[PDB]
Amino acid sequence: ATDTGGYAATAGGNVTGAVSKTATSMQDIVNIIDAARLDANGKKVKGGAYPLVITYTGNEDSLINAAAANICGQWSKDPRGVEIKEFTKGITIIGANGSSANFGIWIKKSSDVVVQNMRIGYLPGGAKDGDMIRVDDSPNVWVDHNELFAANHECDGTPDNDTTFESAVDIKGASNTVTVSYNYIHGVKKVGLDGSSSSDTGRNITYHHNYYNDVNARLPLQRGGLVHAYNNLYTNITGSGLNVRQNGQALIENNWFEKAINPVTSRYDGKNFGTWVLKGNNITKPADFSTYSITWTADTKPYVNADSWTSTGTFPTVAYNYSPVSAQCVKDKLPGYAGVGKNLATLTSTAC
Ligand SMILES: [Ca+2]
Secondary structure, X not given: OOOOOOOOOOOOOOOOOOEEEEEOOHHHHHHHHHHOOEOOOOOEOOEOOOOEEEEEOOOOHHHHHHHHHXXXXXXXXXXXXXXXXXXXXXXXXXXXXXXXXXOEEEEEOOOOEEEEOOEEEOOOOHHHOOOOEEEEOOOOEXXXXXXXXXXXXXXXXXXXXXXXXXXXXXXXXXXXXXXXXXXXXXXXXEOOEEOOOOOOOOOXXXXXXOEEEEEEEOOOEEEOOEEEEEOOEEEEEOOOOEEEEOOOEEEEEOOEEEEEEOOEEXXXXXXXXXXXXXXXXXXXXXXXXXXXXXEOOOOOOOOEEOOOOOOOOOOOXXXXXXXXOOHHHHHHHHHXXXXXXXXXXXXXXXXX
């Protein structure tokens, strides 16, 4: 019921007393959440009055298709997103098949929120934090079976030459336990941070069974804490992958890396290098780099790359229960389980 296969343990809105609602538009989602804060007497209840299961049936393909055709006109528009602020009764936002959104989900100071089967893409407002999914000061969040996409490209003359599009899954603050699973993330320059700054360290996050394709960096950009990445398929990484910083620890197991530049590294700070424990990935030694097109580059400040493909530290005993399939099975099967319209199907060895 509360098993996500990672550090997050939540059933979201699928609990006792849950109220099911259908949202046909972004504004409905907003109105529905607002109504869920009132008690039988019409007075607001801190954290929400009752649990919710919102089924989003909206479709914004027209907005998405128009944006895909004019990539550079997106960054300067107003950002669009539904905010889930201080809602702790339990909430699940699940898209209907055929559903789509050109707006993001921004979670702040909440807990026990699950967002599933949502196809989100080409969001406007990259220069004003137009994230697809943001988890801020929010423990027990599960982002599962979603398709997050844009174009892995940077337009000219954008603020900081970094704002053509914002991130897919940014995690920051006290979001102590989070699970990011079965997502199909493609065409994204900045996938997601795990800590917004050098001081924003900590958290225990699990990234499992995600399919990354044509992404530039931040898988994630980790600042301290623990990150467990297993059964992910990493292909066409154009910049860097898992960047473990501020003495963070990562357990990188049974993943498949292919056509990736700097898949596992610790760079951009020049100090306080993170560590990684590598085991069961398709790459087992430097000899495999050529086999899978793994390239390494240096940085202008002191850095550490896993070009020796050896463990550089340790990792505490993994709390939860999980059963990873082989890296080969991920490569062969994952694409059919990750994303939307897969009916939240999970990959087990039985299917390998
Ligand atoms: Ca952001």
